[PDB]
């Protein structure tokens, strides 16, 4: 079988199974049934899967290198796509609620879940609870006997402390630090001093790299019992240097991709974001071009925003692009060779983790 | 030590614990510690701590029939501290999600969290997040080595989803159920067919007894090793009905509680909730009396409101309380009765909590 067949056989079990649930045991009646049917496939349906598929396609790695009976191999890869599921399921709950956080328009070329007629923004925050709760019925249903349970759980659970940890370091980039207080509305930072590589990267580890490229790594890993086929921290730096990269990319593209390719209106130099473009820009700008990125940014004006992207262009970003892409390949390919040390298999996983975003 | 003062001394603990880690584990800086800081306490203190004292009260009782070591008995009284404050920051994800998500105004006499200046709905979101993840983080901390870890991770797990089920169905009470659709905008009901006993019960026991009554009792069984000193049957269907009992009370008290007593402006008529006053009316009502409920129910405009309140006291419905109350009276007697068979202990506890929700 191949794998996204098999991937997405299994999204239709783990629904039976979750709605099957909800009628048996908590007394759901069929037309709230199919809300949550029709929010399940809104709101995890659609995309690449390529968290869900890396969870598989580094049990697949394992499967082709270590001895087992037919019905073992079956078991490993269905735990490795209810696993995938589980992280899929984890960005859609959190898709939804950032979607409501941010007023967002869009996603992937359709309204926001919140934005739909009957959905609104009342129920789409509990929607987006349900979505992240699922992820634990999931788990304690089709792994209760499993020894990779207990490491599993635990490692969930950082990882989406992890992420919502990071969307607070994402949704507070552009106040001062000094200034955050309950209490007090926020301006927005006049010095953007806080606009640094270091900071920078910090929101990035945190609000992606853990969710979409440590925990799959690690999950397809657990589901192999294979965890001492690697360096840990080995496997966590080459995360969080791919993690930063797709990161990069988005920034980019928020920017610079036509709205209709990208599927949605980019408004990051509105919203003020700390983008790598603005540290980039911040980081070889003179005095002048500072002053007017100050007087443009954040700022919902479509003059100044084109001001914004003019500043840019202008500057010649793609060049610290290529820059930047030439030390990340350096880097990937480095981590990569160390890890096939203990596991050739993982590191081939992770070369195809770093091709698929590298190229896309 | 009196019981209050351990639990609110592990309060200062859990905090530093959660604090101390996100400096040295999550990267984070002084000005969003106190900022995370600062929302803990505004969002997990002030109540009366009733569901994490409940499972200290609990195993307070095992500890006085039960043989242990000193050590031991701090201990327990520790982790049912802990297992507590993972109840109170359950409710505190859910109060501030659920206000946000019913654009509440207050709550306890202060503004909701999200509407202080400095938080914003952006923010608190995500906070509420937070408040959650923080449940998960004690329990992998303080119970790691736990026997009673798994089933009381599992437990949790399930409560938490049977009270976003209890939201949903909340959310959609005054809805048409064959009209649920994601695509179309949700009228109000016009038949009222479904304000009846069993869907109310249905809201109820899903949005509040799971995590006001049940999780307490039985989060104190499981941090006593004594889930075998119970039928858990029983357990079930006493914090059902007490429960019930506790969500009446709140209904009744929404709509003629001065608010500087209740602690905000109840608006259950004018968001048209499927309250115990609207179902024990239209169960009594004749057709002209239902007729001017239904004209005037689900309106913010206060000439209406005002029609529904007077209709509410000129239908006597302080007799249907009083009925109602006789009987659980009754029923919650009978099960104390039926738990004395197994554990006089953890029938006195099921006892307290039982006058603490009657007499209030
Ligand atoms: O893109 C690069 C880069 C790096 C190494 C070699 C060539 C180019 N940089 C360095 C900083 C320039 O302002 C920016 O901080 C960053 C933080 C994380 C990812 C990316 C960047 C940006
Ligand atoms: O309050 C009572 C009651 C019950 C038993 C004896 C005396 C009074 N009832 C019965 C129904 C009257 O419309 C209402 O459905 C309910 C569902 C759950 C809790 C409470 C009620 C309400
Ligand atoms: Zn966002
Ligand atoms: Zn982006
Ligand atoms: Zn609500
Ligand atoms: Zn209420």
Redesign the interface.
């Known amino acids: 079988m191949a794998s996204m067949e098999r991937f997405l056989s299994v999204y239709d079990e783990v629904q039976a199974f979750l709605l099957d649930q ?1 009628q048996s045991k ?4 069929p ?2 049934a ?3 049917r ?2 399940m496939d ?1 709101t995890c349906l659609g995309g690449k899967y390529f968290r869900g598929m890396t969870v598989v396609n580094v049990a697949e790695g394992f499967l082709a290198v270590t001895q087992h009976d037919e019905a073992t191999k079956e078991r490993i890869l269905h735990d490795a796509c209810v696993g995938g599921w589980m992280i899929e399921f984890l960005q859609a709950h959190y898709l939804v ?1 950032d979607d ?4 967002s328009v869009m996603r992937r070329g359709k309204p926001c879940w919140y934005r ?8 789409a ?3 987006g ?2 979505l992240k ?2 992820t ?2 999931m788990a ?1 249903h089709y792994f209760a006997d499993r020894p990779f349970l ?1 490491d599993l ?2 490692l969930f ?1 950082k990882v ?3 992420t ?2 990071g ?3 994402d ?2 980039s552009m106040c001062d ?2 200034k ?7 301006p927005m930072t006049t010095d953007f001093a806080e606009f640094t590589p270091a900071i920078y990267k ?1 929101i990035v ?2 609000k992606t790299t853990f969710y979409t490229y440590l925990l799959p790594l690690v999950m397809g890993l657990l589901v192999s019992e294979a965890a001492a086929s690697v360096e840990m921290n080995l496997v966590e730096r080459v995360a969080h240097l791919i993690g930063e990269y797709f990161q990069v990319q988005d920034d980019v593209m928020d920017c610079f991709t036509p709205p209709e390719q990208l599927g949605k209106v980019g408004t990051d130099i509105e919203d003020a974001k700390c983008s790598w473009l603005a540290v980039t820009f911040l980081g070889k700008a003179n005095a002048a071009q500072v002053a007017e990125f100050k007087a443009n940014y954040g700022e919902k004006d479509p003059a100044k925003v084109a001001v914004v992207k003019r500043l840019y262009s202008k500057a010649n970003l793609q060049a610290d692009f290529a820059a930047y892409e030439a030390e990340v390949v350096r880097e990937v390919e480095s981590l990569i060779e160390q890890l096939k040390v203990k596991s050739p298999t993982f590191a081939e996983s992770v070369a195809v983790v770093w091709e698929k975003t590298h190229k896309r």
Chains 1, 2 share one sequence.
């Open positions: 909800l908590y007394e759901i009646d037309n709230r199919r809300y949550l029709i929010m809104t609620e409501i956080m941010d007023g739909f007629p009957g959905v609104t923004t009342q129920c925050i509990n929607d609870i349900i709760s699922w634990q019925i304690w207990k759980l635990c659970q989406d402390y992890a919502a940890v969307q607070m370091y949704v507070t630090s000094n955050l207080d309950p209490e007090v509305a926020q910090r580890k945190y």
